[PDB]
Amino acid sequence: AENSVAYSNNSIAIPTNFTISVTTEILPVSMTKTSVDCTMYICGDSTECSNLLLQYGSFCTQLNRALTGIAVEQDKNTQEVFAQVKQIYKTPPIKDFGGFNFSQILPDPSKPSKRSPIEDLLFNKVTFNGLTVLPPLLTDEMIAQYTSALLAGTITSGWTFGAGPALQIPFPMQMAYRFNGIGVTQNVLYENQKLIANQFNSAIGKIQDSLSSTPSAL
Amino acid sequence: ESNKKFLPFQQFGRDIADTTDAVRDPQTLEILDITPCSFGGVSVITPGTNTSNQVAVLYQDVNCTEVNVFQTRAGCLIGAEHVNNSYECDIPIGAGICASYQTSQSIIAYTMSLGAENSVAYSNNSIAIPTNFTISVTTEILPVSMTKTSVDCTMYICGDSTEC
Amino acid sequence: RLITGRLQSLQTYVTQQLIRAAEIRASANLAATKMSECVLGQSKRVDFCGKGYHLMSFPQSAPHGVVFLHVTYVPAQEKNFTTAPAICHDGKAHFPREGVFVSNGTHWFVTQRNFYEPQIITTDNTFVSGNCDVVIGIVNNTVYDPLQPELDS
Amino acid sequence: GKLQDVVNQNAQALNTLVKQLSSNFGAISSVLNDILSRLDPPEAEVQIDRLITGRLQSLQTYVTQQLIRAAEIRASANLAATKMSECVLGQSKRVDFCGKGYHLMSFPQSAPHGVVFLHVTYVPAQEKNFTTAPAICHDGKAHFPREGVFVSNGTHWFVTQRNFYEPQIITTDNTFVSGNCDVVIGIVNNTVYDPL
Numbered sequence: 059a060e061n062s063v064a065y066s067n068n069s070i071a072i073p074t075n076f077t078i079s080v081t082t083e084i085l086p087v088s089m090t091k092t093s094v095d096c097t098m099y100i101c102g103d104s105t106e107c108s109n110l111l112l113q114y115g116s117f118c119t120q121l122n123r124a125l126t127g128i129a130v131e132q133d134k135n136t137q138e139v140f141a142q143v144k145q146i147y148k149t150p151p152i153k154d155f156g157g158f159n160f161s162q163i164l165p166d167p168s169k170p171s172k173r174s175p176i177e178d179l180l181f182n183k184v185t186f187n188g189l190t191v192l193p194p195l196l197t198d199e200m201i202a203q204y205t206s207a208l209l210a211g212t213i214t215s216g217w218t219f220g221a222g223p224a225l226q227i228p229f230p231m232q233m234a235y236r237f238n239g240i241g242v243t244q245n246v247l248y249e250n251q252k253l254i255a256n257q258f259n260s261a262i263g264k265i266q267d268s269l270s271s272t273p274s275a276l
Numbered sequence: 277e278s279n280k281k282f283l284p285f286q287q288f289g290r291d292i293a294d295t296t297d298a299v300r301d302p303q304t305l306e307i308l309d310i311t312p313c314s315f316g317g318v319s320v321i322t323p324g325t326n327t328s329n330q331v332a333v334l335y336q337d338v339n340c341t342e343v344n345v346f347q348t349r350a351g352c353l354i355g356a357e358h359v360n361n362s363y364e365c366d367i368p369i370g371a372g373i374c375a376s377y378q379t380s381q382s383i384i385a386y387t388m389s390l391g392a393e394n395s396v397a398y399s400n401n402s403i404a405i406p407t408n409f410t411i412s413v414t415t416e417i418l419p420v421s422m423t424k425t426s427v428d429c430t431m432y433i434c435g436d437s438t439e440c
Numbered sequence: 441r442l443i444t445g446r447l448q449s450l451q452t453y454v455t456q457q458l459i460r461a462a463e464i465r466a467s468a469n470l471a472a473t474k475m476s477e478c479v480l481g482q483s484k485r486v487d488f489c490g491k492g493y494h495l496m497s498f499p500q501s502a503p504h505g506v507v508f509l510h511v512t513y514v515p516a517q518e519k520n521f522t523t524a525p526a527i528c529h530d531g532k533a534h535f536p537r538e539g540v541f542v543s544n545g546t547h548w549f550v551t552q553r554n555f556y557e558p559q560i561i562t563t564d565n566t567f568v569s570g571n572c573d574v575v576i577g578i579v580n581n582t583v584y585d586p587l588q589p590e591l592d593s
Numbered sequence: 594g595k596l597q598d599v600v601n602q603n604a605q606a607l608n609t610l611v612k613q614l615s616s617n618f619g620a621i622s623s624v625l626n627d628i629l630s631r632l633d634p635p636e637a638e639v640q641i642d643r644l645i646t647g648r649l650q651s652l653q654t655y656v657t658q659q660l661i662r663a664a665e666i667r668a669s670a671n672l673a674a675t676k677m678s679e680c681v682l683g684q685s686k687r688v689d690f691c692g693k694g695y696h697l698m699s700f701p702q703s704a705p706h707g708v709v710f711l712h713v714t715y716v717p718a719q720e721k722n723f724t725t726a727p728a729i730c731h732d733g734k735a736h737f738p739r740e741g742v743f744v745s746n747g748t749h750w751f752v753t754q755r756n757f758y759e760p761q762i763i764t765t766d767n768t769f770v771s772g773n774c775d776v777v778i779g780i781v782n783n784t785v786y787d788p789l
């Protein structure tokens with residue numbers, strides 16, 4: 059869209075309001091662990107072919123070594139992403155966060171799999187000649203327990219759990235320090251605490267509708 | 277024995293990858309599935325040889341009633357017992373199962389401990405402030421360059437031969 | 441004849457897997473950087489934790505992936521204002537400390553840049569640096585001393 | 594072990610290339626000199642070309658594997674140039690880029706085919722219980738801290754920084770007035786000492 063903002067040497071524009079926006083960013087982490095054996099893929103059950111395969115030397119010694127190095131780093135790729143914290147933090151049962159609602163991102167204990175409602179539809183939208191599939195090092199429940207530990211360490215502590223011991227702080231107070239990091243004073247949060255919490259709750263609930271709106275988001 | 281719905285003129289059965297999955301026996305009107313005979317790699321789980329010489333054999337991707345025995349999702353373990361308590365992982369196996377050498381000593385198998393359980397006290401009028409600190413020095417190692425190696429086809433493939 | 445064709449299929453498949461392993465690990469190294477900077481802290485970098493001023497973000501576990509819910513600060517409603525770089529006084533030039541001088545047509549005020557909250561231009565939120573013949577575009581306005589009415593009592 | 598893998602993967606791939614010279618590749622002899630000395634030159638050309646295809650595929654595998662590991666090393670080398678520009682040549686605001694904790698400085702150390710960073714970090718040690726309030730009401734005014742936090746030890750309220758405990762008397766110098774005290778939820782009642 060063509061925009062021509064009015065420029066002058068003594069004119070400025072200052073926002074009198076704001077809007078809390080929640081955006082969704084998706085990044086892949088790991089592949090599928092797959093190992094192929096030359097003994098069964100090229101010629102299975104034939105003893106006259108395995109004698110002929112020894113004439114080529116060690117083509118398949120380094121071929122299975124390369125696929126083993128891929129599969130050992132797929133499990134490694136989860137480690138530096140989801141296991142950044144060493145301890146597991148639990149959200150207290152009293153959900154008093156100054157009007158802020160985290161029910162879409164907190165895990166649901168009623169389900170057999172302790173996952174958040176946002177994580178519930180994320181998994182629902184995603185679906186032998188020497189071929190095998192190795193299981194991953196961490197299960198899907200263990201990654202979700204890693205996510206719940208980092209989620210409880212952000213609402214309760216903030217950034218203090220990543221730079222040392224976890225220091226408790228109310229969510230209605232640590233949100234002002236996020237406002238101070240972008241040049242906004244503390245009084246803007248406290249004068250509009252009901253409006254910001256209503257804007258945060260509406261933007262979180264719109265993520266679940268936008269994810270299920272189209273299958274091209276994933 | 278299968279419960280497929282083969283047509284009366286149909287005898288063969290193939291999947292997407294064009295592999296024979298179910299064929300009729302020609303005399304009796306019966307359907308028989310064909311799954312491949314079970315195979316997998318053999319993995320040996322051991323501690324250091326200076327510690328002990330005991331080993332645990334992991335038969336990957338097989339129900340090993342056909343071949344202590346503890347069945348996992350990565351196969352099954354031979355010679356490694358299963359314990360109810362959870363420890364830190366040192367030797368990975370897969371699917372949240374890790375083997376170790378602890379307790380007169382034998383290889384045990386357990387579920388991974390993701391970390392120490394911490395429940396920090398949260399309140400709407402409570403804060404935590406450090407009254408002290410600790411200067412910590414950590415070591416980070418990053419590779420920079422490889423080894424410069426040049427290979428010539430004139431000498432590697434066939435040296436001293438003018439007919440090649 | 442079958443061995444050469446089948447080994448070339450494996451040599452193509454392993455090479456294509458090593459190409460896609462570097463693409464996934466580059467995203468996995470990015471995803472470890474995102475959780476260290478967007479989740480475990482507040483990032484000063486622009487457009488690294490969503491569009492807008494970053495406040496916080498929340499991770500979400502996904503099958504073979506990670507989903508980030510970047511909470512951002514986006515300004516909504518702005519309007520017309522008249523600004524000056526500084527305000528001259530009795531032989532002095534006054535510059536704002538952490539604010540900006542704005543005018544609504546008649547009166548001049550000082551406020552922050554990310555939100556409209558005008559205040560009276562006093563000596564507490566302004567500092568004196570030189571006279572008012574060097575700065576181009578300086579205007580004339582008074583600066584309210586918050587200690588002068590206490591002296592006259 | 595990060596620097597041990599670069600030496601090990603380069604040396605083991607080189608020894609594999611030497612081991613490919615002893616392969617028959619479907620020919621009579623792996624060694625070249627016995628093929629000419631035992632077969633006639635008009636029909637020796639079939640036996641030569643079996644060794645050429647096998648040996649050229651060993652080089653085509655080795656060069657392709659070297660180009661894969663070149664991109665892995667250069668990605669770490671581009672990271673190591675970023676680390677020295679941000680952790681050594683300055684103070685980084687990014688979390689967990691120059692060690693675990695609040696980054697102060699770092700020192701480089703030269704290594705064989707690598708670089709070692711000694712990240713000096715700031716880690717808090719000893720915290721205890723405190724009672725906090727978002728603001729403090731006054732005679733028609735609400736007081737917010739400038740760069741501190743309001744804390745209480747049970748009886749008296751104090752203002753201090755967040756990364757270290759150093760309480761001070763809540764005065765008008767370190768607090769600013771923004772509105773009255775009927776909008777902010779959780780505001781408490783305390784006096785503010787005027788230093789004038």
Ligand SMILES: *[C@@H]1O[C@H](CO)[C@@H](O[C@@H]2O[C@H](CO)[C@@H](O)[C@H](O)[C@H]2NC(C)=O)[C@H](O)[C@H]1NC(C)=O
Pocket residue numbers: 074075076077253256257516517
């Ligand atoms: C700033 O914007 C918010 C919404 O983005 C405004 O809040 C709305 O105010 C109207 C006023 O009648 C209400 O009807 C709406 O219900 C409010 N929305 C919500 C979500 O509560 C707010 O008034 C704006 N403030 C200013 C000063 O313009």
Ligand SMILES: *[C@@H]1O[C@H](CO)[C@@H](O[C@@H]2O[C@H](CO)[C@@H](O)[C@H](O)[C@H]2NC(C)=O)[C@H](O)[C@H]1NC(C)=O
Pocket residue numbers: 153159160161162263
């Ligand atoms: C947080 O939001 C959820 C919805 O996103 C709220 O759950 C609703 O609760 C009301 C009554 O409390 C029910 O009538 C709705 O059917 C619920 N909706 C869903 C989708 O469960 C939840 O109550 C909110 N949390 C708080 C503390 O109010």
Ligand SMILES: *[C@@H]1O[C@H](CO)[C@@H](O[C@@H]2O[C@H](CO)[C@@H](O)[C@H](O)[C@H]2NC(C)=O)[C@H](O)[C@H]1NC(C)=O
Pocket residue numbers: 407408409410718719
């Ligand atoms: C903060 O921690 C440091 C150590 O991390 C404390 O210093 C020690 O104090 C004891 C007190 O008897 C001495 O015996 C030690 O020798 C000191 N250690 C060192 C390395 O000098 C310091 O006292 C702590 N400060 C507070 C206020 O708790």
Ligand SMILES: *[C@@H]1O[C@H](CO)[C@@H](O[C@@H]2O[C@H](CO)[C@@H](O)[C@H](O)[C@H]2NC(C)=O)[C@H](O)[C@H]1NC(C)=O
Pocket residue numbers: 544545546547
């Ligand atoms: C610019 O803002 C100032 C500050 O609010 C305005 O001055 C006041 O305007 C109201 C009208 O709503 C009067 O009742 C007050 O008496 C004014 N204050 C003083 C000290 O005179 C001013 O009118 C605004 N100018 C414009 C053009 O909107």
Ligand SMILES: *[C@@H]1O[C@H](CO)[C@@H](O[C@@H]2O[C@H](CO)[C@@H](O)[C@H](O)[C@H]2NC(C)=O)[C@H](O)[C@H]1NC(C)=O
Pocket residue numbers: 528578579580
């Ligand atoms: C701001 O006020 C000062 C004085 O109050 C103005 O300075 C005067 O400028 C005129 C014409 O330039 C001279 O004739 C006077 O002698 C000056 N007075 C003094 C005391 O220096 C200044 O011009 C004003 N600025 C603006 C932009 O109006």
Ligand SMILES: *[C@@H]1O[C@H](CO)[C@@H](O[C@@H]2O[C@H](CO)[C@@H](O)[C@H](O)[C@H]2NC(C)=O)[C@H](O)[C@H]1NC(C)=O
Pocket residue numbers: 746747748749
């Ligand atoms: C909270 O801190 C204040 C400030 O130090 C304490 O007030 C002083 O306490 C000492 C006791 O060691 C007395 O000797 C002083 O007279 C007190 N000062 C004043 C102005 O009364 C207060 O006791 C502390 N409260 C608690 C519960 O520890």
Ligand SMILES: *[C@@H]1O[C@H](CO)[C@@H](O[C@@H]2O[C@H](CO)[C@@H](O)[C@H](O)[C@H]2NC(C)=O)[C@H](O)[C@H]1NC(C)=O
Pocket residue numbers: 730780781782
């Ligand atoms: C802080 O003090 C003010 C006055 O010193 C309190 O305001 C009084 O509140 C009571 C009951 O709410 C009313 O009956 C009075 O008329 C109020 N007085 C004034 C001057 O407004 C206020 O409640 C106190 N806050 C707390 C948390 O104790």
Ligand SMILES: *[C@@H]1O[C@H](CO)[C@@H](O)[C@H](O)[C@H]1NC(C)=O
Pocket residue numbers: 303304305
């Ligand atoms: C096959 O033929 C014999 C006759 O010799 C008959 O008895 C038998 O039932 C037949 N089998 C089937 C499956 O029809």
Ligand SMILES: *[C@@H]1O[C@H](CO)[C@@H](O)[C@H](O)[C@H]1NC(C)=O
Pocket residue numbers: 339341
């Ligand atoms: C392995 O075989 C036993 C039969 O004794 C069966 O109960 C079990 O479910 C099988 N395991 C799997 C993973 O199919």
Ligand SMILES: *[C@@H]1O[C@H](CO)[C@@H](O)[C@H](O)[C@H]1NC(C)=O
Pocket residue numbers: 358359360
């Ligand atoms: C582990 O606990 C189960 C009951 O949950 C029990 O049957 C089993 O014997 C226990 N195993 C050991 C080694 O104690």
Ligand SMILES: *[C@@H]1O[C@H](CO)[C@@H](O)[C@H](O)[C@H]1NC(C)=O
Pocket residue numbers: 064065066069519520521
């Ligand atoms: C706002 O008004 C000023 C003058 O009052 C004018 O110079 C400027 O161009 C206007 N801006 C817009 C976006 O209308």
Ligand SMILES: *[C@@H]1O[C@H](CO)[C@@H](O)[C@H](O)[C@H]1NC(C)=O
Pocket residue numbers: 067068576577
């Ligand atoms: C600002 O621009 C106007 C014309 O648009 C001009 O008359 C005036 O002198 C300029 N002021 C400064 C300080 O450059």
Ligand SMILES: *[C@@H]1O[C@H](CO)[C@@H](O)[C@H](O)[C@H]1NC(C)=O
Pocket residue numbers: 397398399402721722723
């Ligand atoms: C510290 O004490 C306060 C009350 O004095 C209490 O609410 C809080 O839970 C305590 N925190 C810890 C970690 O004991």
Ligand SMILES: *[C@@H]1O[C@H](CO)[C@@H](O)[C@H](O)[C@H]1NC(C)=O
Pocket residue numbers: 154400401778779
């Ligand atoms: C803080 O929580 C307590 C209960 O834990 C409640 O009684 C009190 O009203 C709350 N205060 C605010 C300001 O939310």
